Design an enzyme around this catalytic site. Structure first.
Site, mmCIF file in Angstrom:
data_model
loop_
_atom_site.group_PDB
_atom_site.id
_atom_site.type_symbol
_atom_site.label_atom_id
_atom_site.label_comp_id
_atom_site.label_asym_id
_atom_site.label_seq_id
_atom_site.Cartn_x
_atom_site.Cartn_y
_atom_site.Cartn_z
ATOM 1 N N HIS A 1 9.682 57.744 43.815
ATOM 2 C CA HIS A 1 9.833 58.998 44.514
ATOM 3 C C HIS A 1 10.226 60.070 43.524
ATOM 4 O O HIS A 1 10.729 59.777 42.445
ATOM 5 C CB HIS A 1 10.931 58.789 45.573
ATOM 6 C CG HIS A 1 11.092 59.917 46.544
ATOM 7 N ND1 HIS A 1 10.060 60.403 47.315
ATOM 8 C CD2 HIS A 1 12.188 60.625 46.892
ATOM 9 C CE1 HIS A 1 10.516 61.371 48.097
ATOM 10 N NE2 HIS A 1 11.807 61.517 47.867
ATOM 11 N N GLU B 1 12.036 67.717 49.084
ATOM 12 C CA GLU B 1 11.256 66.491 49.014
ATOM 13 C C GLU B 1 10.244 66.373 50.144
ATOM 14 O O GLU B 1 10.418 66.903 51.245
ATOM 15 C CB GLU B 1 12.151 65.250 49.023
ATOM 16 C CG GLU B 1 12.947 65.070 50.328
ATOM 17 C CD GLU B 1 13.754 63.791 50.365
ATOM 18 O OE1 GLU B 1 13.590 62.957 49.457
ATOM 19 O OE2 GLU B 1 14.539 63.598 51.306
ATOM 20 N N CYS C 1 5.379 62.797 47.869
ATOM 21 C CA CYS C 1 6.436 63.285 47.001
ATOM 22 C C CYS C 1 5.905 63.977 45.748
ATOM 23 O O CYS C 1 6.289 65.118 45.439
ATOM 24 C CB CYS C 1 7.396 62.160 46.644
ATOM 25 S SG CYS C 1 6.697 60.761 45.681
#
Length: 208
Positions: free
Chosen positions: A168, A180, A119
């Site tokens: 994240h 993402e 991420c």
């Protein structure tokens, strides 16, 4: 309620310092993420017609400041370049710890044998294109840039999850979508924004 329960409810990979990003075994060279980022930053400032001899190419604002190297008038262009870089990686495999300023890379621990992005790796790769240098750890990324209330997130802002943004991180694309590198076995993707575990602020690295 602290975490996005669709992903491992643990801190994201934390890759220290300024890792090697480019290796050419034939020519015998290597360079780090910060070197790659500085070089791209200088190139980007040159493309805007504003490169100065004092420019290192690193364009981050001091953390919390609304003023930084890239003029606001060129901020939308900078943001769109960052987003284009990220979007160009749609379909690259997820790798825990993967990615550097030059592109996907081998990960660590779990991801040591897999070339891809995690991420924070995807976010740092995307932003490096305009000289915005980010550490390879979502929690540390959360401490940089300028906070914007999450309800006011704008295309190009960066969305965080988990305590201190440690779980994240993604790039908001506007229209309730985000870019993402999600989880093992998946690929870099566009997905709907998720609010479970979301921090109360998004981060803005580029003003416009």
């Amino acid at each position: 309620g602290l975490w996005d329960p669709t992903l491992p409810m643990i801190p994201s990979a934390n890759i220290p310092g300024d890792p090697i990003a480019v290796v050419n075994q034939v020519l015998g060279i290597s360079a780090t993420s910060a070197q790659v980022t500085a070089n791209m930053g200088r190139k980007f400032l040159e493309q805007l017609g504003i490169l100065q001899p004092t420019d290192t190419g690193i364009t981050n604002a001091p953390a919390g400041s609304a003023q930084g190297r890239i003029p606001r008038v060129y901020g939308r262009q900078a943001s769109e370049y960052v987003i284009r870089r990220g979007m160009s990686q749609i379909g690259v495999p997820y790798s825990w710890g993967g990615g550097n300023a030059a592109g996907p890379s081998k990960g660590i621990d779990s991801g040591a044998g897999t070339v891809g992005f995690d991420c924070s790796g995807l976010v740092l790769y995307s932003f490096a294109g305009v000289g915005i240098k980010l550490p390879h750890y979502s929690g540390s990324q959360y401490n940089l840039g300028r906070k914007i209330p999450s309800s006011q997130m704008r295309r190009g802002d960066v969305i965080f999850y988990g305590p201190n943004g440690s779980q994240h991180v993604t790039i908001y694309l506007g229209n309730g979508q985000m870019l993402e590198a999600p989880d093992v076995g998946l690929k870099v993707r566009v997905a709907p924004v998720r609010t479970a575990g979301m921090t109360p602020y998004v981060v803005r690295y580029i003003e416009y």
